[PDB]
């Protein structure tokens, strides 16, 4: 009956409720450090000169 | 009876909500307002690729940043050269109701599928000079909504019968089935290390799946309607979604929360496509009011607008080195922006 | 994949013949075709060209007004018509496949040839070696030179390497200088810059004995080098 | 020669500032809402052929009868090849919308597979390259330096561009009538009664503007002339300013496409 | 010119691909594209059989004209996610069985599905051919069961010819798009080729009346 799908959904939420989490301050400060370390390598953020841009004509 | 389910479900929903709310120290808008603004971004149309005769539903860049592939509602699949605007191949299809395409990572195969419930594989490197079929993969009971390769022998699909799947191309049989959504599944996106993938469906919920263990691991809620597009951050530890709610959102895999929302009052139509840039600073969202916007991903301001089509923009993709941006639309034109 | 061709024979000077080849499966209607030629105990030489769709047709300045080429496309057959033969036309004749798009590999299948014995501004390639002796197991280097730079403004260098075992047809090895063909062992390699190019072999086996040729494909009248022979 | 009147030549100035300044102010607003589909080029090449031909004509006709001016065989005919090629480029454009609206009923299955932009953008480039090859063409009674054997050549061509307009709207009003019987009687008197009140208004404005002034021109070839015919050709030539204002009342305003596009601006 | 000998042959290839991609595009400006709907009764079985896993396509010819017909009943998923693929078909074919007025649960269900497709935002200018099946079995049940089981507000006779004429007024009163689109009812005379010639007339009516809007004449 529906007693099988009742016990199946409880076992899913049991596995998910005990996973470990960190503070949201450290998870937000790590997203800035990737964008600052790669700002030189992004061509859409700082436009390159027309010599090495291969879509000039 | 079934009433003994009710205390188990209600306590675990209350336990997860108390666990997420405890670790919310400060928002992303609070720590980032000391950073400098992006300024103003103005981009222009460098190429215009013509030759389709109907609406365009899918597009995918190759991995050498020069070739791409596209599919329309005519029975055609065309491989382009983006520097010289030349055509390399043109492939006739068996069914005309096409909604997906994907390019192989080795540049060796290409895949396609739609309302005929089948994903088909094509071979570009034969000994006779023709593109042929190699496999046809059957077993879904609903329209295919997306497809992505892992290598030359494994492919992950997605259909509208609430079910994702992992295949083997050499034998033909599916080896893992991913169940747990209650609505039709619309999109997926792999990870950079190629071990996990996210998926978004009509439940207004998105799930994180494990490829090798074959089970769900986390679930994210917060939208108010169907999710049409999803994309993975280049670090590997965030993603962004796109809905008919007219709102993009940014989620986290290590804090299990929402970080920021990208909304504005003058937008009332829904998002079709979502992609990031190379440094992960820009967020490009194709909309339904005929244009595309550009968002600063760290401060939720908008930076630019890309307007070139009479009709709905249905697909977009940013290249692997970071030069160009492609878009496709229902007025049958591809445009490369730079 | 096959190209099978026939004709030839003994011709009094001033006569006429035609030559013909056949294709098998092969998707014949997407490949441009050539006719390449070699004399007895001499090097290779290029003759004619007919494109896909029978559009662009080119010739050599030696055969401009005597030879004409045509394609019979639904029957999978290629033609070459001869008029007013001379003594310089005693040679072999080879039908050669090619495809031109981004990433392809031209000049990759030769036919088996057909004998013909009659009765009795250009880029110049050169290579000086002739019948060098090589002990097996050791590395060899073969080089040819050009009178003009083959590097183009788009980045490509158009030099192609061939191999011809005795009694066989030629075979593609290096189709553009840093790229090797399919079916070829990984011990072969090739490098060079500007107007100086060289081939290299890592570990010589018993089957690499034969002649070698280098060809340019930058400006159109195609020129082969002379014959460099390996012997044991 | 230039004889009309000393007092009755003082109201055409009060008439041609209000029958020519509307057809400049109307054929410009039509081009301010054009959006474009490949059968709106043929409306374009009569919306601009009645803008050039209704300032050059208004300035030249006010130059000659009222306050006077003289010229010679090069200053004058520079303006007589510049009112001819702007009226035979306004009859060639009425002839193209009646060769287009005839392949929309005679072969309805095959109509979007014939009238395409490769055969409809070059198509008005051979009416502006034959209308300016028959108005420079004089290299060499009422018109000064034009021989009598040339007006029998302009009329002999402009007539048969008015006998495929009183024929290509009497095969729409017949084929779309016998069709309206078959699909009401069995099929499920409403169709050819909404095509018989915007197809009669066209042929009652085209026969009372190219019918008086192409009739007085026959009086010069076919015999003699008199005085009071010269004093009335100056008002009968003001019919050409009438068939320039009403054409954006009959063609461009009589649609729902150009009246849906009118609302959101 | 500044092109190599390879790069000059990679544009002759791309111009022979467009010359076949165009020649398969006026080849499909000849054919008529029809969608089919209705609830999953046996009414679809008669219509497909008489005109000679996700999408099923049927093609047939009648007086030198080519039709293609698309059955989309085998999907059983969310309809609002693939129904914009059919924007641009010529006419929609609907199917209703007359005799199911008492099994009043079924007849209201067909009125719910007719009302949703007639007023979509994707089908503002599409004609609806409407078939009505089981006319022979309908006069048998009406002699035993009155029409007031299905429609309580029926003040009519409950004879045969006055009841079947009350069904056509109910489907055609649901149209809120009176100034753009039209419905052509025809009772399914299942004996002859009259089924396909009504439908031959219904598409010549809509092609002619579409060309008289492209030239701006209406
Ligand atoms: C005697 O003339 C005139 O003073 C004027 C005012 N022009 C007319 O009076 C006039 C009035 C009409 C209706 N047309 C007409 C139209 C089409 C073709 C021809 C022709 F000459 F080629 F046969 C003539 N010209 C002109 C002044 C400068 C150039 S003309």
PDB file of N, CA, C and O and ligand atoms in Angstrom, chain D residues 1 56-57 59-65 75-85 87-88 134-135 142-144 146 150-151 154-155 158 210 213-214 217 233-234 236-238 240, ligand 1:
ATOM      1  N   UNK D   1       2.081  78.346 -75.395  1.00  0.00           N
ATOM      2  CA  UNK D   1       2.173  79.731 -74.948  1.00  0.00           C
ATOM      3  C   UNK D   1       1.339  79.865 -73.677  1.00  0.00           C
ATOM      4  O   UNK D   1       0.558  78.977 -73.356  1.00  0.00           O
ATOM      5  N   UNK D  56       7.808  69.301 -57.212  1.00  0.00           N
ATOM      6  CA  UNK D  56       8.354  69.733 -58.495  1.00  0.00           C
ATOM      7  C   UNK D  56       7.246  70.193 -59.436  1.00  0.00           C
ATOM      8  O   UNK D  56       7.402  71.195 -60.143  1.00  0.00           O
ATOM      9  N   UNK D  57       6.102  69.506 -59.437  1.00  0.00           N
ATOM     10  CA  UNK D  57       4.982  69.955 -60.258  1.00  0.00           C
ATOM     11  C   UNK D  57       4.343  71.217 -59.699  1.00  0.00           C
ATOM     12  O   UNK D  57       3.935  72.093 -60.466  1.00  0.00           O
ATOM     13  N   UNK D  59       5.790  73.557 -57.930  1.00  0.00           N
ATOM     14  CA  UNK D  59       6.679  74.690 -58.130  1.00  0.00           C
ATOM     15  C   UNK D  59       6.796  75.094 -59.589  1.00  0.00           C
ATOM     16  O   UNK D  59       6.973  76.281 -59.883  1.00  0.00           O
ATOM     17  N   UNK D  60       6.671  74.147 -60.513  1.00  0.00           N
ATOM     18  CA  UNK D  60       6.815  74.490 -61.921  1.00  0.00           C
ATOM     19  C   UNK D  60       5.535  75.090 -62.487  1.00  0.00           C
ATOM     20  O   UNK D  60       5.586  75.968 -63.351  1.00  0.00           O
ATOM     21  N   UNK D  61       4.381  74.625 -62.013  1.00  0.00           N
ATOM     22  CA  UNK D  61       3.115  75.132 -62.524  1.00  0.00           C
ATOM     23  C   UNK D  61       2.777  76.489 -61.922  1.00  0.00           C
ATOM     24  O   UNK D  61       2.049  77.275 -62.538  1.00  0.00           O
ATOM     25  N   UNK D  62       3.295  76.790 -60.727  1.00  0.00           N
ATOM     26  CA  UNK D  62       3.163  78.137 -60.177  1.00  0.00           C
ATOM     27  C   UNK D  62       4.182  79.082 -60.799  1.00  0.00           C
ATOM     28  O   UNK D  62       4.062  80.302 -60.656  1.00  0.00           O
ATOM     29  N   UNK D  63       5.166  78.548 -61.522  1.00  0.00           N
ATOM     30  CA  UNK D  63       6.226  79.338 -62.133  1.00  0.00           C
ATOM     31  C   UNK D  63       5.815  79.904 -63.481  1.00  0.00           C
ATOM     32  O   UNK D  63       6.371  80.914 -63.921  1.00  0.00           O
ATOM     33  N   UNK D  64       4.845  79.285 -64.147  1.00  0.00           N
ATOM     34  CA  UNK D  64       4.674  79.521 -65.572  1.00  0.00           C
ATOM     35  C   UNK D  64       3.425  80.324 -65.904  1.00  0.00           C
ATOM     36  O   UNK D  64       3.487  81.247 -66.720  1.00  0.00           O
ATOM     37  N   UNK D  65       2.292  80.001 -65.283  1.00  0.00           N
ATOM     38  CA  UNK D  65       1.028  80.669 -65.568  1.00  0.00           C
ATOM     39  C   UNK D  65       0.823  81.900 -64.691  1.00  0.00           C
ATOM     40  O   UNK D  65       0.676  83.012 -65.205  1.00  0.00           O
ATOM     41  N   UNK D  75      16.786  74.455 -70.036  1.00  0.00           N
ATOM     42  CA  UNK D  75      16.328  74.770 -68.689  1.00  0.00           C
ATOM     43  C   UNK D  75      14.908  74.266 -68.484  1.00  0.00           C
ATOM     44  O   UNK D  75      14.558  73.773 -67.407  1.00  0.00           O
ATOM     45  N   UNK D  76      14.081  74.343 -69.528  1.00  0.00           N
ATOM     46  CA  UNK D  76      12.673  73.972 -69.418  1.00  0.00           C
ATOM     47  C   UNK D  76      12.490  72.459 -69.385  1.00  0.00           C
ATOM     48  O   UNK D  76      11.784  71.937 -68.515  1.00  0.00           O
ATOM     49  N   UNK D  77      13.122  71.741 -70.315  1.00  0.00           N
ATOM     50  CA  UNK D  77      12.914  70.303 -70.429  1.00  0.00           C
ATOM     51  C   UNK D  77      13.592  69.524 -69.309  1.00  0.00           C
ATOM     52  O   UNK D  77      13.284  68.343 -69.120  1.00  0.00           O
ATOM     53  N   UNK D  78      14.509  70.156 -68.570  1.00  0.00           N
ATOM     54  CA  UNK D  78      14.993  69.619 -67.300  1.00  0.00           C
ATOM     55  C   UNK D  78      13.859  69.449 -66.299  1.00  0.00           C
ATOM     56  O   UNK D  78      13.901  68.542 -65.461  1.00  0.00           O
ATOM     57  N   UNK D  79      12.829  70.290 -66.379  1.00  0.00           N
ATOM     58  CA  UNK D  79      11.662  70.110 -65.534  1.00  0.00           C
ATOM     59  C   UNK D  79      10.548  69.325 -66.217  1.00  0.00           C
ATOM     60  O   UNK D  79       9.609  68.899 -65.539  1.00  0.00           O
ATOM     61  N   UNK D  80      10.631  69.110 -67.531  1.00  0.00           N
ATOM     62  CA  UNK D  80       9.640  68.303 -68.234  1.00  0.00           C
ATOM     63  C   UNK D  80      10.053  66.841 -68.342  1.00  0.00           C
ATOM     64  O   UNK D  80       9.214  65.989 -68.644  1.00  0.00           O
ATOM     65  N   UNK D  81      11.310  66.526 -68.068  1.00  0.00           N
ATOM     66  CA  UNK D  81      11.695  65.174 -67.739  1.00  0.00           C
ATOM     67  C   UNK D  81      11.651  64.905 -66.257  1.00  0.00           C
ATOM     68  O   UNK D  81      12.030  63.822 -65.805  1.00  0.00           O
ATOM     69  N   UNK D  82      11.205  65.892 -65.482  1.00  0.00           N
ATOM     70  CA  UNK D  82      11.051  65.774 -64.049  1.00  0.00           C
ATOM     71  C   UNK D  82       9.634  65.939 -63.554  1.00  0.00           C
ATOM     72  O   UNK D  82       9.441  66.241 -62.368  1.00  0.00           O
ATOM     73  N   UNK D  83       8.635  65.799 -64.419  1.00  0.00           N
ATOM     74  CA  UNK D  83       7.253  65.632 -63.990  1.00  0.00           C
ATOM     75  C   UNK D  83       6.703  64.446 -64.770  1.00  0.00           C
ATOM     76  O   UNK D  83       5.697  63.843 -64.386  1.00  0.00           O
ATOM     77  N   UNK D  84       7.390  64.071 -65.849  1.00  0.00           N
ATOM     78  CA  UNK D  84       7.008  62.882 -66.595  1.00  0.00           C
ATOM     79  C   UNK D  84       7.430  61.608 -65.879  1.00  0.00           C
ATOM     80  O   UNK D  84       6.606  60.713 -65.681  1.00  0.00           O
ATOM     81  N   UNK D  85       8.679  61.529 -65.420  1.00  0.00           N
ATOM     82  CA  UNK D  85       9.159  60.331 -64.741  1.00  0.00           C
ATOM     83  C   UNK D  85       8.660  60.204 -63.309  1.00  0.00           C
ATOM     84  O   UNK D  85       9.026  59.240 -62.632  1.00  0.00           O
ATOM     85  N   UNK D  87       5.154  60.723 -62.849  1.00  0.00           N
ATOM     86  CA  UNK D  87       3.785  60.270 -63.047  1.00  0.00           C
ATOM     87  C   UNK D  87       3.708  58.924 -63.741  1.00  0.00           C
ATOM     88  O   UNK D  87       2.720  58.210 -63.558  1.00  0.00           O
ATOM     89  N   UNK D  88       4.722  58.544 -64.513  1.00  0.00           N
ATOM     90  CA  UNK D  88       4.789  57.196 -65.047  1.00  0.00           C
ATOM     91  C   UNK D  88       5.529  56.258 -64.109  1.00  0.00           C
ATOM     92  O   UNK D  88       5.688  55.076 -64.430  1.00  0.00           O
ATOM     93  N   UNK D 134      12.495  56.892 -70.712  1.00  0.00           N
ATOM     94  CA  UNK D 134      11.440  57.377 -71.594  1.00  0.00           C
ATOM     95  C   UNK D 134      11.065  58.796 -71.183  1.00  0.00           C
ATOM     96  O   UNK D 134      10.035  59.328 -71.609  1.00  0.00           O
ATOM     97  N   UNK D 135      11.899  59.415 -70.347  1.00  0.00           N
ATOM     98  CA  UNK D 135      11.736  60.813 -69.979  1.00  0.00           C
ATOM     99  C   UNK D 135      13.024  61.607 -70.132  1.00  0.00           C
ATOM    100  O   UNK D 135      13.023  62.816 -69.887  1.00  0.00           O
ATOM    101  N   UNK D 142      -0.048  72.504 -77.096  1.00  0.00           N
ATOM    102  CA  UNK D 142      -0.087  72.979 -75.718  1.00  0.00           C
ATOM    103  C   UNK D 142       1.225  72.764 -74.974  1.00  0.00           C
ATOM    104  O   UNK D 142       1.472  73.463 -73.978  1.00  0.00           O
ATOM    105  N   UNK D 143       2.069  71.827 -75.402  1.00  0.00           N
ATOM    106  CA  UNK D 143       3.410  71.655 -74.862  1.00  0.00           C
ATOM    107  C   UNK D 143       4.397  72.222 -75.866  1.00  0.00           C
ATOM    108  O   UNK D 143       4.320  71.860 -77.050  1.00  0.00           O
ATOM    109  N   UNK D 144       5.306  73.125 -75.459  1.00  0.00           N
ATOM    110  CA  UNK D 144       6.077  73.908 -76.439  1.00  0.00           C
ATOM    111  C   UNK D 144       7.003  73.146 -77.383  1.00  0.00           C
ATOM    112  O   UNK D 144       6.738  73.099 -78.587  1.00  0.00           O
ATOM    113  N   UNK D 146       7.721  69.866 -78.135  1.00  0.00           N
ATOM    114  CA  UNK D 146       7.513  68.425 -78.261  1.00  0.00           C
ATOM    115  C   UNK D 146       6.745  68.160 -79.544  1.00  0.00           C
ATOM    116  O   UNK D 146       5.667  68.724 -79.749  1.00  0.00           O
ATOM    117  N   UNK D 150       5.120  62.238 -80.618  1.00  0.00           N
ATOM    118  CA  UNK D 150       5.578  61.711 -79.342  1.00  0.00           C
ATOM    119  C   UNK D 150       4.461  61.545 -78.325  1.00  0.00           C
ATOM    120  O   UNK D 150       4.534  60.630 -77.499  1.00  0.00           O
ATOM    121  N   UNK D 151       3.430  62.386 -78.365  1.00  0.00           N
ATOM    122  CA  UNK D 151       2.289  62.195 -77.480  1.00  0.00           C
ATOM    123  C   UNK D 151       1.438  60.998 -77.865  1.00  0.00           C
ATOM    124  O   UNK D 151       0.671  60.515 -77.029  1.00  0.00           O
ATOM    125  N   UNK D 154       3.416  58.229 -75.690  1.00  0.00           N
ATOM    126  CA  UNK D 154       3.223  58.176 -74.250  1.00  0.00           C
ATOM    127  C   UNK D 154       1.829  57.679 -73.903  1.00  0.00           C
ATOM    128  O   UNK D 154       1.660  56.901 -72.958  1.00  0.00           O
ATOM    129  N   UNK D 155       0.817  58.122 -74.653  1.00  0.00           N
ATOM    130  CA  UNK D 155      -0.552  57.688 -74.397  1.00  0.00           C
ATOM    131  C   UNK D 155      -0.738  56.235 -74.822  1.00  0.00           C
ATOM    132  O   UNK D 155      -1.410  55.454 -74.137  1.00  0.00           O
ATOM    133  N   UNK D 158       0.682  54.248 -71.717  1.00  0.00           N
ATOM    134  CA  UNK D 158      -0.024  54.472 -70.460  1.00  0.00           C
ATOM    135  C   UNK D 158      -1.489  54.033 -70.534  1.00  0.00           C
ATOM    136  O   UNK D 158      -2.127  53.843 -69.493  1.00  0.00           O
ATOM    137  N   UNK D 210      -7.746  59.837 -64.441  1.00  0.00           N
ATOM    138  CA  UNK D 210      -6.930  59.589 -65.623  1.00  0.00           C
ATOM    139  C   UNK D 210      -7.811  59.523 -66.858  1.00  0.00           C
ATOM    140  O   UNK D 210      -7.403  58.959 -67.876  1.00  0.00           O
ATOM    141  N   UNK D 213      -8.095  64.062 -68.204  1.00  0.00           N
ATOM    142  CA  UNK D 213      -6.868  64.666 -68.714  1.00  0.00           C
ATOM    143  C   UNK D 213      -6.170  63.786 -69.743  1.00  0.00           C
ATOM    144  O   UNK D 213      -5.279  64.264 -70.447  1.00  0.00           O
ATOM    145  N   UNK D 214      -6.534  62.515 -69.845  1.00  0.00           N
ATOM    146  CA  UNK D 214      -6.123  61.751 -71.010  1.00  0.00           C
ATOM    147  C   UNK D 214      -7.097  61.875 -72.157  1.00  0.00           C
ATOM    148  O   UNK D 214      -6.888  61.236 -73.186  1.00  0.00           O
ATOM    149  N   UNK D 217      -5.843  65.529 -74.048  1.00  0.00           N
ATOM    150  CA  UNK D 217      -4.614  65.270 -74.791  1.00  0.00           C
ATOM    151  C   UNK D 217      -4.854  64.602 -76.137  1.00  0.00           C
ATOM    152  O   UNK D 217      -3.985  64.691 -77.006  1.00  0.00           O
ATOM    153  N   UNK D 233      -7.319  73.295 -69.537  1.00  0.00           N
ATOM    154  CA  UNK D 233      -6.291  72.295 -69.277  1.00  0.00           C
ATOM    155  C   UNK D 233      -5.480  72.639 -68.035  1.00  0.00           C
ATOM    156  O   UNK D 233      -4.853  71.750 -67.452  1.00  0.00           O
ATOM    157  N   UNK D 234      -5.497  73.902 -67.610  1.00  0.00           N
ATOM    158  CA  UNK D 234      -4.815  74.322 -66.395  1.00  0.00           C
ATOM    159  C   UNK D 234      -5.549  73.921 -65.121  1.00  0.00           C
ATOM    160  O   UNK D 234      -4.904  73.792 -64.077  1.00  0.00           O
ATOM    161  N   UNK D 236      -7.733  71.076 -65.332  1.00  0.00           N
ATOM    162  CA  UNK D 236      -7.804  69.637 -65.525  1.00  0.00           C
ATOM    163  C   UNK D 236      -6.481  68.957 -65.202  1.00  0.00           C
ATOM    164  O   UNK D 236      -6.446  67.737 -65.018  1.00  0.00           O
ATOM    165  N   UNK D 237      -5.397  69.726 -65.095  1.00  0.00           N
ATOM    166  CA  UNK D 237      -4.124  69.206 -64.629  1.00  0.00           C
ATOM    167  C   UNK D 237      -3.979  69.264 -63.117  1.00  0.00           C
ATOM    168  O   UNK D 237      -3.000  68.735 -62.586  1.00  0.00           O
ATOM    169  N   UNK D 238      -4.924  69.891 -62.416  1.00  0.00           N
ATOM    170  CA  UNK D 238      -5.013  69.780 -60.967  1.00  0.00           C
ATOM    171  C   UNK D 238      -5.724  68.517 -60.504  1.00  0.00           C
ATOM    172  O   UNK D 238      -5.978  68.378 -59.303  1.00  0.00           O
ATOM    173  N   UNK D 240      -4.161  65.725 -60.887  1.00  0.00           N
ATOM    174  CA  UNK D 240      -3.018  64.945 -60.437  1.00  0.00           C
ATOM    175  C   UNK D 240      -2.653  65.224 -58.986  1.00  0.00           C
ATOM    176  O   UNK D 240      -2.003  64.385 -58.357  1.00  0.00           O
TER     177      UNK D 240
HETATM  178  C1  LIG F   1       3.445  73.344 -70.518  1.00  0.00           C
HETATM  179  O1  LIG F   1       3.710  72.503 -69.430  1.00  0.00           O
HETATM  180  C2  LIG F   1       3.858  73.156 -68.202  1.00  0.00           C
HETATM  181  O2  LIG F   1       3.841  74.338 -68.131  1.00  0.00           O
HETATM  182  C3  LIG F   1       4.047  72.331 -66.934  1.00  0.00           C
HETATM  183  C4  LIG F   1       3.494  73.079 -65.727  1.00  0.00           C
HETATM  184  N1  LIG F   1       3.493  70.996 -67.055  1.00  0.00           N
HETATM  185  C5  LIG F   1       2.122  70.685 -67.407  1.00  0.00           C
HETATM  186  O3  LIG F   1       1.317  71.521 -67.644  1.00  0.00           O
HETATM  187  C6  LIG F   1       1.711  69.224 -67.480  1.00  0.00           C
HETATM  188  C7  LIG F   1       0.514  68.699 -67.039  1.00  0.00           C
HETATM  189  C8  LIG F   1       0.529  67.351 -67.279  1.00  0.00           C
HETATM  190  C9  LIG F   1      -0.658  66.454 -66.919  1.00  0.00           C
HETATM  191  N2  LIG F   1       1.696  67.074 -67.835  1.00  0.00           N
HETATM  192  C10 LIG F   1       2.265  65.823 -68.309  1.00  0.00           C
HETATM  193  C11 LIG F   1       2.209  64.618 -67.626  1.00  0.00           C
HETATM  194  C12 LIG F   1       2.800  63.487 -68.162  1.00  0.00           C
HETATM  195  C13 LIG F   1       3.471  63.562 -69.367  1.00  0.00           C
HETATM  196  C14 LIG F   1       3.544  64.763 -70.037  1.00  0.00           C
HETATM  197  C15 LIG F   1       4.285  64.851 -71.360  1.00  0.00           C
HETATM  198  F1  LIG F   1       4.621  66.148 -71.598  1.00  0.00           F
HETATM  199  F2  LIG F   1       5.412  64.093 -71.301  1.00  0.00           F
HETATM  200  F3  LIG F   1       3.495  64.384 -72.359  1.00  0.00           F
HETATM  201  C16 LIG F   1       2.949  65.888 -69.507  1.00  0.00           C
HETATM  202  N3  LIG F   1       2.430  68.218 -67.963  1.00  0.00           N
HETATM  203  C17 LIG F   1       5.528  72.131 -66.717  1.00  0.00           C
HETATM  204  C18 LIG F   1       6.398  73.066 -66.085  1.00  0.00           C
HETATM  205  C19 LIG F   1       7.811  72.497 -66.060  1.00  0.00           C
HETATM  206  C20 LIG F   1       7.823  71.203 -66.673  1.00  0.00           C
HETATM  207  S1  LIG F   1       6.339  70.814 -67.171  1.00  0.00           S
END
